[PDB]
């Protein structure tokens, strides 16, 4: 039964360093059963440290949707990112405030994105207080700053440079800079990106980034 | 006997007396 399955190497876009995702498999072509629909719109949850060959990014996972089949090589594109459960459970601690923000952002290629940002209040070096809490007004100010930044980056740019912003997580650093005047923050991240609708599949656009 | 069940028993006898005398 696993002799009628052909392995099709998976390639990540040249946005990432390593493009050696894997070799997912699909049955042989047959009546209305060519391998195209087998690999049609498959998602591949892969770690970022794999693509970036950097372990420090092991906390991040990347989803990639297979939308074409170039012979035996299947090419993928960005389909959102997320945290590992371990990192999220490590950050959410007591005696500190958690700030969460979501927003809907449109890019130049009709890609609708919902970006989720996470932030935690940071203790000062000389703090004697056993808790570090922000007032509900301060949390609302920081959520405003986080959402305005999320809109400012994602709307201006396109998916390729948007992800190029995700990988070093410069958005988190800008949020930390912009909210330092309200309340010092720690572990500020874009925890999750969800692609809600995607434009009509363009083959040349796909080969542009592959 | 538990007081809750005593009250339930008494509510039941009263239902009965009411449905007898009134009707």
């Amino acid at each position: 039964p696993f002799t009628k399955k052909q392995w099709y190497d998976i390639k990540a876009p040249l946005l990432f360093t390593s493009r050696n995702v894997g070799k997912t498999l699909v049955s042989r072509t047959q009546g209305t059963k060519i391998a195209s629909e087998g690999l049609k719109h498959r998602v591949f949850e892969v770690s970022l440290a794999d693509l970036q060959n950097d372990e420090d990014q092991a906390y991040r996972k990347i989803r990639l949707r297979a939308e074409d089949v170039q012979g035996m090589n299947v090419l993928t594109n960005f389909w959102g990112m997320d945290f590992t459960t371990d990192k999220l459970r490590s950050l959410v601690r007591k005696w500190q405030t958690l700030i969460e923000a979501h927003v809907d952002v449109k890019t130049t290629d009709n890609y609708m994105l919902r970006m989720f940002a996470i932030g935690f209040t940071k203790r000062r070096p000389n703090q004697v207080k056993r808790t570090c809490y922000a007032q509900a007004s301060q949390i609302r100010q920081i959520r405003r700053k986080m959402v305005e930044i999320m809109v400012n980056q994602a709307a201006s740019c396109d998916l390729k440079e948007l992800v190029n912003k995700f990988i070093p997580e410069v958005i988190g650093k800008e949020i930390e800079k912009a909210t330092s005047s309200i309340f010092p923050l720690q572990n500020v991240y874009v925890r999750k990106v969800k692609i809600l609708k995607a434009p009509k599949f363009d083959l040349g656009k796909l080969m542009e980034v592959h | 006997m538990r007081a809750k069940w005593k009250k339930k028993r008494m509510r039941r006898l009263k239902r009965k007396r009411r449905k007898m005398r009134q009707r």
Binding site: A49, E55, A58, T84, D86, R89, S90, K94 | -
Partner: protein, 98 residues
């Protein structure tokens, strides 16, 4: 006789507190009254640690942990020895384990 000053819970300056469900028996216990423990364990038993750290493609790979906040009713917390019956004097001690 009133056994505790706080009545076995943590509720001052408020009325209703939403309940949780016991991890063991699915009992409805108030959040402030239920015994709450934050267990940070490893997905790999202390024993399998070496064998797993060996079968790893990536040489640099810290083994992921498990974080879980466990909720227990009084009956299950006593049965599981999470909390034990204490003498009258020692009950007023709220300090975490020394």
């Amino acid at each position: 006789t009133f056994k505790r000053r706080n009545g076995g819970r943590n509720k001052h300056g408020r009325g209703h507190v939403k309940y949780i469900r016991c991890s063991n028996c699915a009992k409805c216990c108030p959040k402030d009254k239920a015994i709450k423990r934050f267990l940070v364990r490893n997905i790999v038993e202390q024993a399998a640690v070496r064998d797993v750290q060996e079968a790893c493609v990536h040489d640099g790979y810290v083994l992921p942990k498990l974080y879980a906040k466990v909720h227990h009713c009084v009956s299950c917390a006593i049965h599981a020895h999470i909390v034990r019956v204490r003498s009258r004097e020692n009950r007023r001690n709220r300090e975490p384990p020394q």
